[PDB]
């Protein structure tokens, strides 16, 4: 249970919360209640970019890249409705939050690939 001052500059602020190995339970859904996701967090650990080879024939592969914009990549504080559908499926409908990060990664050889890493809407 840490304060800002414990965290500032460690890199921990770009990390999503985790759960212990013991958290293998079950969260009951009461078809009668209304639900929300009060916090969604997404922390990327890998960016892959599909190569664009010279002849379409040979499937192009996603290859690893180097992040050049530092620990600024996570999506967080995202919230919204968690609907219970006729068939008992749940539907998350994002309303708001820090739901995008610009990110630049670099291909082998140096080509930079900016992207708007997002789950908007």
Partner 1 sequence: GLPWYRVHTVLINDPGRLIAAHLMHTALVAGWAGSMALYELATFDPSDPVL
Ligand X SMILES: CCCCCCCS[C@@H]1O[C@H](CO)[C@@H](O)[C@H](O)[C@H]1O
**Residues forming the site for partner 1 (CB under 8 A):** 53-54, 108-109
Tell me the closest approach of the beta carbon of residue 31 to ligand X, in angstroms. 56
From ligand X, partner 1, none, interface partner of 54 (C-beta below 5 to 8 A by class): partner 1
Tell me the closest approach of the beta carbon of residue 111 to partner 1, in angstroms. 9
- State the DSSP string of the chain: ---HHHHTTSSGGGS-----TT--------TTS-EEEEEEEE-----EEE---SSSSS---EEE-EE-S-S---EEEEEEEEEEPTTS-EEEEEEEEE-EEEEEEE-TTS-EEEEEEE---
Examine residue 109 and tell whether it contacts ligand X (CB under 6 A).
Answer: yes
Write the interaction track for ligand X spanning residues 60-99; mark x where CB under 6 A is met and - where it is not. Answer: ----------------------------------------
Examine residue 110 and tell whether it contacts ligand X (CB under 6 A).
Answer: yes
């Amino acid at each position: 249970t840490l304060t800002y001052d414990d965290i500032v500059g460690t890199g921990l602020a770009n990390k999503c919360p985790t759960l212990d190995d013991t958290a293998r339970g079950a969260y009951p859904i009461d078809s009668s209640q209304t639900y929300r996701i009060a916090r969604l967090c997404l922390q990327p650990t890998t960016f892959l970019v599909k190569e664009e080879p010279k002849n379409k024939r040979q499937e192009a592969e996603f290859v690893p890249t180097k992040l050049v914009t530092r620990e600024t990549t996570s999506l967080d504080q995202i919230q919204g409705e968690l609907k219970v559908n006729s068939d008992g499926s749940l539907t998350f409908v994002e309303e708001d939050g820090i739901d995008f990060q610009p990110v630049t990664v670099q291909m082998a050889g140096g080509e930079r690939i900016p992207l708007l890493f997002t789950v908007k809407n």
